[PDB]
């Protein structure tokens, strides 16, 4: 469940009394009683108002953050900390635009641990005006990930092993090194 019941001490943008006829407003019990009925219906107008905030990942309640995660495939499994989810969902849609590229692999692991990684690989770009010139680049594929963690508890390697497994382009062998 969620226990998202009524809230005490909340006003309304549509007071029931303010919509009553004239002369009717002169009474004492009438004004007090009907304003009581506003208490039960108050939070609904709060939701209908400011509904836009109820979709921004950086501000929406925790439940919708996981909901938003499955909305654009944020890979939210295994995270039991609310602040960790906040960055992942908002930044998820940008990663898939460059998922596979070297920056994307670096950022994803940077996202999961908060520190920028060091990576070396059989990659690079070059040009030569010479006709039919050769292209350098290591003849044997190799992908390496290095993390400069300050507190290397011996579980990060598996987490780095698991995370980089889906980041590599099903193409090269990989190895994981953690400080």
């Amino acid at each position: 469940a969620s226990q998202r019941g009524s809230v005490d001490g909340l006003g309304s943008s549509l007071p029931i009394a303010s919509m009553l006829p004239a002369v009717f407003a002169d009474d004492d019990l009438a004004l007090r009683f009907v304003a009581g009925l506003d208490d039960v219906l108050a939070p609904i107008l709060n939701v209908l108002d400011c509904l836009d905030t109820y979709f921004d990942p950086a501000l929406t309640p925790a439940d919708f953050a996981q909901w938003l995660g499955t909305w654009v495939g944020a890979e939210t499994d295994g995270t039991e900390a609310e602040p960790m989810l906040r960055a992942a969902v908002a930044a998820a849609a940008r990663l898939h635009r460059v998922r596979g590229t070297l920056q994307g692999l670096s950022e994803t692991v940077r996202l999961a641990f908060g520190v920028a990684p060091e990576i070396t690989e059989s990659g690079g770009a070059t040009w030569n005006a010479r006709p039919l010139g050769p292209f350098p680049g290591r003849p044997r594929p190799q992908l390496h990930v290095a993390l400069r963690l300050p507190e290397p508890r011996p579980v990060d390697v598996h987490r780095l092993d698991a995370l980089v497994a889906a980041a590599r382009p099903a193409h090269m062998p990989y190895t994981v090194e953690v400080t």
Binding site: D52, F55, A62, P131
Partner: protein, 528 residues
Amino acid sequence: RRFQQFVDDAKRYIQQRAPEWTDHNVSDPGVTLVETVAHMADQIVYRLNRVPDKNHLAFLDLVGITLFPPSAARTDVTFWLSAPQEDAILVPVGTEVATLRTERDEAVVFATEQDLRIVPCTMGRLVTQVSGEAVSDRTTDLAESKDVLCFAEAPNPGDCMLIGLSAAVPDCALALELDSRVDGVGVDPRQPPLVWEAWTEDGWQSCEVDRDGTGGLNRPGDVVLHIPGGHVLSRNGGHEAGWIRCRVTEPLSGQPFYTTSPTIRSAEAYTIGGTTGSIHAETVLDEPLGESTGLPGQRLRLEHAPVVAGEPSVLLQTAADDGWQDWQVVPHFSGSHPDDHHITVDATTGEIAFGPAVREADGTLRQYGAVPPKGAVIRARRYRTGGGRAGNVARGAVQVLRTSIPYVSEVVNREAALGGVDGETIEEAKLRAPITLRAQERAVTLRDYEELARRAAPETARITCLEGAENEYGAHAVRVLVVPQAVPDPGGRLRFEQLVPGDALLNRITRHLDERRLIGTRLAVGPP
């Protein structure tokens, strides 16, 4: 597509008469009206079905789309004056000079970006000079009397008339008197194309002519010039002044020079105006908005153009017992405890938000950003406008300077506005999302590599991508062949040098494909 419907009309709600509760048998005009004044459900139900534009902005932020922001135009504002007496800061920064207001619409108001200073410019030294005749430490050619030989009565390329400029104000409109004894056949002033220089620290600097009695001194004229930046003369003598070089170009067929040009008898230099570029902007004070409802999620609108980007330009003051509480604008509501006073503003529209609230998946609320209490008056102390297309003012239109603080005079802009661009609307951005969200950006298959290179260099004729075959190093890399365009002469033959591409063309191709590489395959380009 297949959208659910959420409408249940108002009258159907009053169907819950349910007279099965004993003694409540009454009709319309009873004080049982509370059955009806709960018709707000009809307003609530109608509000449910609507999906306003405000959510369509969150979707664009959610999928990594940046709303296109607006800009503004920048022009060249040129002052004038007739009393060049002293030097001081005669223009505070942000001095506002506006267009004339007609019956059609409220005039557009500009704003200077720099500080303009008038200077009492005087002269330096006048020196005789001709092609190949340097100054050679000569100053008194026209210091006392007699005359200075104008290009030895023979103007040819390499010639120059030498006059000093004691101030040479980088942003002043210098005017020089050119009194010349008339000798020989008279000429039209526009007939000889004399080019005027300034000798800036980086080299000689061109200049423009605004008067008629300039160069073609058939009669004693008075040339005016707006000074093009800071500069000094080639100091050899007794005058550290500025410089003007009345260089003469080659004799054009339709614009030829003449022998025995007018000599210089007397001359005086004095600036009359100043030129400074301006950015379309304005400042508005004391724009009250109304009273706060003391509820979370309040939204307020300004009835003016988009706020121009810069320092916090929406100073919200709210009534309080101690006085005018100050609200400081903040970026997106990432974190704001209930104590803090923070607001959110829109750059491209007047919609100004407040602290939103969320029920959260538990009891109670959680407010991000405080709310003004009930009855507080909200006003905008300072507020800057100026963005949009309505700054593309026609050439020479801005005429009136605001508040006329200094010894002001006629103000005009010599050149038309550069041209601002309006920020994209929500409806406009709703059409970009299907396109801009799937623009490749991966370079996976063979089609992309030839396509992506074409986007980087639209001027290429033929591009193709062939992978490095087996028994070749580079980790199964790829080769790209580039063919620069070339007209193969009217003679039917094409040189090989025309086939090799420029180095910059190869680099700009390589630079783009470097970022969108997939695994690490090398992309070396070049002719086949």
